[PDB]
Ligand binder design. Structure first.
Ligand code: CL
Ligand code: CL
Ligand code: CL
Ligand code: CL
Ligand code: CL
Lengths: 311, 311, 311, 311, 311
């Protein structure tokens, strides 16, 4: 079968709808997520119009092979979606109501700048390519756009699932293409990061600052260097796959700062020891006493600056 | 072929049954489990009724293509099930007995609050979407619901496999959906956690408390900081992928408390040393002596409170 | 097509055979193994019997579609096997000789109690479900059961590949099922565990016992605590994915004992130091001197008890 | 069908085009990348020519089976591509315009010599094998070569996607092969390596150099050996799967140098201590004082030499 | 169709050829490698004979379905090769020339005894099972055996790709099988192991030997025990998945020896300290002085013995 002909020169409108049944496997490192949903399609085919009285039914059911069906695809998918046609209904005026259930792995970039206090807009791009006999344009049927109440993404809060009504019409490979943007907004559940990651990492850093209440060089070396090892080992324990970004992130800046702090603490411990050995205890004592305040104060200030710069 | 028509207006009843053959890959991180089972279906189609005397047969066998079959799907699956039709039998009255063997990856959320002493109810939701001509409703054949004796889930005790008899009937995209809840009750085998994880982790923490029987600051620094490293290294060794939860868990609270305890132990060691150096040994001695009791007592008390709050 | 009818009321016997070509990927954690083999099937169909006089051919070759073939499946597989029909031969009396080459991922539970000195019996369960007209029973053709000489399983010694001749006949989903048990006996190659894992782990433990020849508390703390870190780090290096078991294992008991030994060694080091500081060197000296013998002796004794208890 | 015959002795020209829709999974370890693209093909088959006036149509649409299609394959793919034919249009002169959407895993070697400041040229080799009746030659339509604006490779800057116009024509197994080289130029986003990896690794090395301002052998041993552990632990934390190369790399040379530096620092600490103990403090003091300058200077010089040799 | 009949009772010869296009993913742990190659087949089927004058063609082209094709399989594959048929050419005498491009994961055992200075012979076994009407025998067409110049295996040098001309003909399940051995000779690129693994590991061991130039027990304990931790941590950093072997390997022996050396160094440090404390400094001094030579000498000697025993 070939596409329905226009009455006049008009393009064929395909009314679309996506209804989320399941969302899962949001992979931060791959920048992908898996979706299981309904894809509803609607268009007019006058060749399928009938008289309900002379035919004996109010609705007609067809097998996909029996009628012409627009070839709809997703742009940002890894491999083509897994689809099962659920229903094909034709109304007296020739209106076709198509419904399929599909599953797909969607490629959608993420912004890590505010991780782990970030929000993301996931995109699902629907596309149709025009045929020789006529142009095909996509539209959104808002009554057929939504999500199941029990839809969840582990580690995320689902904000909304909507579609940008106006399609993007453009030329690709010498034909017109009609593209729709379906948007899934999510915000990361940051709660667990506080007791699990941030607080223990700060405790380890605070342990190193005890070296400012000790004049024992051997003990101070153990304090600063062993806490540095504990910090690295803790980071191995707690690490999750985050991809390499061409921009600076909030977490990246803090982590770099923590390393810088271990380094400066070694400098202080080295300087305090050298001055004592070189018969200058007054200088050594005033540097250590200032460090007791300078280290937590500079750390608190830098964090406020970073929090302000990123949020 | 379209669905069988009704006698009066009554909906078509599809009698369901799921029999577990294999259960495997219960992934705590992904909150999924794989299942290999039988799906039995039964309904009556009058258009299939025959005279056994004329036909010379008491039962008729059909290929799926030859007859109308209800489109049954699973709600909480990653991809649509891989199914192999085993048998289709039609009796003289038009009763169809359908049987398939299928494999599916099921998405079912887990409650980690009581991990590793948790129990879970895994769900397998069966669904049917109604058609234009008639409404399709699902029913449970509790007799045809079971599991093979050899069915095992590594690390779990399988309690029961059943279904909630009453289906959930609701509207979705202008059509009725009939949903059945099949429930697989499991409880975690916690035994191994005691010698493998809990006891060695406690031993490492108890080692740090020996610093309260020593006035050597250099030895105490090594004790507390090196045990903190041992704790982290031990946690790397025994870790399993638990996902990040928006709620506090029993294990999460304990682990945080263990870090807090290493931190407070450093504080004590720092304070005891500072008072000795600042010519106050009486204060330093009474703080260390109180710590010998305060540390195990507060630890035992906090654990009882947490165990009470979570169980 | 439909099954061959019986002459008298006798069930149809399907003579089976499995011949191993390749065995691989024995996954201890998943409790699965992959197999590549031949599945030979043989049964009698009188409708296919032909007179060798007015025909021409000695044996007739058929395509799977042309004739009735029993639906044979594996019980303990993840997904249905990938099979390629190699040959279908029909002899004058209607004896059908079927041959396929298949690959499958088999789910077979393992007993870890004696790991790494364990032996396992891997099972491949063949099954047939009976039909409306007649009952189907499985049998073993011993001349068609075996394995290729080159068959190897990395890390294991293949003892034998046999079948339990008597099938297990039972009811399931209102029909008779005939199940055969094919057994692949294997024993773990434990050799490498001795130089790679056991010996270095013992050396690390023996290092901690040197603390009984030293009265230096600072050195003893480093000895016991740093060896505990070395032990944990070594275990991270050599670990393999053994699953969590509801029973105690030989390795599990030894590893727990090693942790207990590090703990008791800290106790001793703590006690020896405390007694010296509390003007009791005689007691401290006799505890350390006894520990020099008590630690290796108790360790040797406990190991003998455990080895006896598990073997 | 067989290929269109030649008018004179000329080969059949197949005009090719590749348009990138998605690029993902650039695996440095496997030296592979996944691609989702359009493959456009164009050639003339005179047997397909028609009269538009008689036919009443200006374009003819065909199913792949109905007409002869050149067998185009990729050389450097893991498996054959997953392709979906989108369009086949025939114009009155017999010009065929073919379009498919495909996904493929491409094997393309990477040069690690300049990692992480490297640039790579990814190759996608298109090939056609000639037939008995006629020679098939590939051509590029650079207009039909491009990429979607949203195409991204995590951690890389996509510079260009082009084709080398001249195909490589050669004999293989007694037939002509026409090969086209499609090139995807990428350059690694090195920014993040500076704060995340290089700077913390240098800080850890600088900590070891503080041993040159201390005469305490116990503190110096801890400084050098504990920083060596911190360096190794840090490398475990921030590391990606680079494959083993038969050539020396920039990163490989630097990392080796860092280990050599830890070794020489131990030598210095050992020598300084030995001379002091052997009543030679003047020598010990001058070696340590020279090391304060020698270590950073030699490190800065060697890095300049390496940077010059590799860039 | 069925196989071509014999003129007399001669077997059917199938001339084979394998031409390597790509080789990749040599997995040491799984003992597998992936291959992308051409499989060329040639045999005579007189039923396909034609007169070039009548047909107007000197060569005929067929689709796989249209003619009888020998069922060729690989013995040592995981699943079955997935091939796409490239060409089928029949000459007037009925000589068929078949060509397919395939991809396959091949299971081929590796000898780790000499790792990482090892060489391997990878095998690809081609097989054909004979039929009732006639025996099928495999042959090698040497003009159709080879590899593309660009063929590479990351981490390996490809020496040669050849076939053992004489097939292995044997009986299996009452039928003849004709097996060919295709051999891919490779040698490991060991270069990178020298700066990346061997040299840093030796440096760490040499650091422990500095304890023989120090009488400080506390410093010596830190030296030997902390280097042991560095060694283990380094091994975690550089480790690759070698499988467990029932035989001793060169690398296995060296690694065991390194652990033994750390153990004996602790013994020495323990003995030296004990003798000093037990008023025997002369003995302690001569043991330490002998160790300065004994440790590097015994290490150099044992390595020479091991290198001789393994090479
Ligand atoms: Cl799609
Ligand atoms: Cl489903
Ligand atoms: Cl199966
Ligand atoms: Cl391809
Ligand atoms: Cl194969």
């Amino acid at each position: 079968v070939s596409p329905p002909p226009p009455i006049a020169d008009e393009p064929l409108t395909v009314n679309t709808g996506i209804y989320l049944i399941e969302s899962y496997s949001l992979d931060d490192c791959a920048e992908t997520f898996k979706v299981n949903a309904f894809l509803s399609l609607s268009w007019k085919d006058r060749r399928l119009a009938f008289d309900p009285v002379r035919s004996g039914v109010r609705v007609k059911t067809y097998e996909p092979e029996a009628i012409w069906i627009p070839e709809i695809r997703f742009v940002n998918v890894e491999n083509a979606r897994d689809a099962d046609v659920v229903d094909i209904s034709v109304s007296p005026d020739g209106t076709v109501q198509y419904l399929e259930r599909f599953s797909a792995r969607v490629l959608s970039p993420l912004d890590f700048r505010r991780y782990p206090f970030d929000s993301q807009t996931l995109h699902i791009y629907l596309i149709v390519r025009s045929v020789d006999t006529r142009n095909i344009v996509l539209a959104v049927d808002l009554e057929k756009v939504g999500k199941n109440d029990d839809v969840f993404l582990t580690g995320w809060d689902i904000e909304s699932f909507t579609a940008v009504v106006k399609p993007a019409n453009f030329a690709l490979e010498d034909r017109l293409e009609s593209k729709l943007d379906y948007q899934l907004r999510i915000s990361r559940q940051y709660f667990s990061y506080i007791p699990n990651i941030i607080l223990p990492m700060l405790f380890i850093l605070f342990i190193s600052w005890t070296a400012f209440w000790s004049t024992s060089y051997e003990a101070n070396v153990t304090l600063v260097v062993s806490t540095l090892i504990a910090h690295i080992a803790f980071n191995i324990l707690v690490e999750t796959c985050l991809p390499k970004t061409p921009y600076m992130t909030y977490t990246g800046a803090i982590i770099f700062m923590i390393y810088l702090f271990y380094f400066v603490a070694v400098i202080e411990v080295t300087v305090q020891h050298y001055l004592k050995v070189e018969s200058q205890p007054a200088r050594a004592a005033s540097i250590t006493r200032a460090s007791r305040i300078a280290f937590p104060v500079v750390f608190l200030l830098a964090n406020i600056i970073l929090a302000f710069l990123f949020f």
